Each structure stands twice: as C-alpha cells, then as structure tokens.
Amino acid sequence: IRVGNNFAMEINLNANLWRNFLYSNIALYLPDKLKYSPSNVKISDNPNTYD
Amino acid sequence: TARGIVTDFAFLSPLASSAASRSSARDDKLTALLAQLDSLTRELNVVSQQLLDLRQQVSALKASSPP
Numbered sequence: 001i002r003v004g005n006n007f008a009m010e011i012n013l014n015a016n017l018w019r020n021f022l023y024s025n026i027a028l029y030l031p032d033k034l035k036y037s038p039s040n041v042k043i044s045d046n047p048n049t050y051d
Numbered sequence: 052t053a054r055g056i057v058t059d060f061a062f063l064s065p066l067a068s069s070a071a072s073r074s075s076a077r078d079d080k081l082t083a084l085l086a087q088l089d090s091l092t093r094e095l096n097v098v099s100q101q102l103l104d105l106r107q108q109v110s111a112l113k114a115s116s117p118p
Contacts, residue, residue, distance in 0.1 A: 037064075039060065039063065
C-alpha cells in the first residue's frame, strides 16, 4: 500500500512546445557569425555545403 | 551598439584560438610585406625610368659641346 501521495514528476508542456518551435524555426537560421563550430567533429571547410 | 559573442567555442577550444593567432600572424606578414614590396617596386621602377631618361639627356648634352 502506498502511504501518502504517489510518486510523480513534473514538466511544463506549452513552454516546451513553444521552446522547440522557436529554437528550430528561428535559431537554426541565424547568420553564421553567431553560430560556431562544434568540438571533436570533422566539418567541411567550404561554408556553402550542406555539411 | 556592440555585437560580438562569437568567442564562445573559441574559449571552448584552445586549438581554435592558436590557429586563429597563426592566421592573424600570417595575414599580417602577407598584407604588410606584399603592400610594402609592391609600393617599393613601383617607386623603384618610376625612379629608374626617370634616371634613364635623365642619363640620356646628359649624354646628349655632353656630346653637343665637343671641347
């Protein structure tokens, strides 16, 4: 028998959805100067490639 | 206005900073030396051309007064 309330976890939903939408559809399109280069991963030296 | 935060993963990557420093040094060398050498070569060419013309005139003047 459980004594007291049941174990549970919390998460804000609307905030998460809005954050996903905003991050994708804006952040992934900022000018490259604000973007950086990752770490320990090879990346094309040509800036115009998809990579 | 002021706009720069791009140094984020530059701080996160010492090798990137070292490569940027080497690139800056190479750019300094290339730009400064090439500009100086080009200006000097231009000046030397102009002076040499004028000097040759003056030498020709002096030779003519020497030839035109046969003491």
